[PDB]
Amino acid sequence: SHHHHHHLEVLFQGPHMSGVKVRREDAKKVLELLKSVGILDGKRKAIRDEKYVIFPVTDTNIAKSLGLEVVDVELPMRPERQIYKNLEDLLPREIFKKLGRLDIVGDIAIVSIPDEILSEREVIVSAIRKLYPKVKVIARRGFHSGLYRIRELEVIWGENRLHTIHKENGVLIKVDLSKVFFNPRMKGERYRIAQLVNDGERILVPFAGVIPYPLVIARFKNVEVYAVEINEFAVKLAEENLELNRDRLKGKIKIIHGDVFEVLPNLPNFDRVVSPTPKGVDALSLTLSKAEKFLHYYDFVHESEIERFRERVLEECRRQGKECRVSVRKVSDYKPHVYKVCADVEILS
Ligand SMILES: Nc1ncnc2c1ncn2[C@@H]1O[C@H](CO)[C@@H](O)[C@H]1O
């Protein structure tokens, strides 16, 4: 006596060799459809030409019951190994070129996605998820808003949170991107100055945020750092960060919750001042006034204004009766024709 047909029908060992041929304009719809009905073959790649897309299917009868055109095609197997090293490898150039720079903060990936390629959201996420399998949050970014310069962010994939712990230069940085400002790309800078700093210095860091700069400096050198931040949530996270990194800091950090322009005139002077100035803000005079040996003044300057920028720094140096050497460095490419720069000011004796 024999087997039931509805038991036999699943015994075939061969691979699926067919697919469905659809117009490109239908391709997303159909993909969804195939996934929903449950006949989408994950083992094979989809291919396309200039007019049509072909999706691999696991049941051609059901495919025909969906009114789709069944074709016999040898489709590429899915890759098992992964050799992509950057996002451009995982996206068409027309999509990738409109994307902003991708940033990783802890287990959060942040990318800017213009409205015109927003329909392609799902491939973008996919690519990101493929490049960074460890991240658990993908958020679309806008601009910085308000006095605290908090980045506009919308979670578009993963856990519905914008808080995490970021590892940098040997320190741990608790961050909440919905409540505080933070830029990971300053890593280099923060390390650099940390290496320049000598033991015994008194250092001032205005606009300190969740104190990544004081944390790195104090991580590598036995110094005292004053940090000034006006955002109380950032202050809170800064305290938690100070407590989190306490047993790995050589230096000391004093956190001051307040307005830089109010606090600094009531502070004593320092050996070194490090000013991660908010974009558009001019704190040159005030930060220089608190520096006795070195100022590191960050700013955003247009390509054709660098010279003028340097000149103005020198002017301020003369204005405060200081004799200085001024060096201007391009820290990063901020947007076209616009650089994030740093004025290294050596105050001479
Ligand atoms: N007058 C200010 N005083 C102290 N911190 C400030 C001031 N303006 C901006 N910030 C902080 O500087 C950081 C970088 O812009 C942010 O955390 C922001 O809240």
Residue numbers in the entry: -15 to 333
Show me the paper's own sentences about this structure.
The structural basis of the bifunctional substrate specificity of PaTrm5a is interesting but currently unclear. In this study, we solved the crystal structures of apo-PaTrm5a and PaTrm5a in complex with 5′-methylthioadenosine (MTA), S-adenosyl-L-homocysteine (SAH), and adenosine (ADN) respectively (the chemical structures of these ligands were shown in Supplementary Fig. S1). The 38.5-kDa protein is composed of three domains: D1 (M1-P60), D2 (N70-S162) and D3 (K163-S333). The four structures of PaTrm5a reported in this study all adopt an “open” or extended conformation distinct from that of Trm5b.
To gain more insight into the mechanism of substrate recognition, we soaked or cocrystallised various nucleosides with PaTrm5a and determined the 2.2-Å crystal structure of ADN-bound PaTrm5a, which shows clear ADN density in the map. ADN is recognised by a fashion virtually identical to that of SAH or MTA: the hydrogen bonding network of the adenine ring involves a total of six residues and two well-positioned water molecules, and is further stabilised by the hydrophobic interactions with Ile214, Phe191 and the adenine ring. In PaTrm5a, the OD1 and OD2 atoms of Glu213 in motif 2 form hydrogen bonds with both the O2′ and O3′ hydroxyls of the ribose (left, wheat). A pairwise superposition of the Cα atoms of the ADN-bound MjTrm5b and PaTrm5a gives an overall root-mean-square deviation (RMSD) of 3.0 Å for 211 out of the 333 atoms aligned. However, the RMSD of the D3 domains between the two structures is as low as 0.89 Å (over 100 Cα atoms). The large overall RMSD of the former may be attributed to the completely different D1 position of PaTrm5a, which adopts an extended conformation in all four structures. Compared to the ADN-bound MjTrm5b structure, D1 in PaTrm5a is displaced as far as 80 Å. In the complex structures, the MTA-, SAH- and ADN-binding pockets align well, and the network of hydrogen bonds that stabilises SAM is maintained completely.
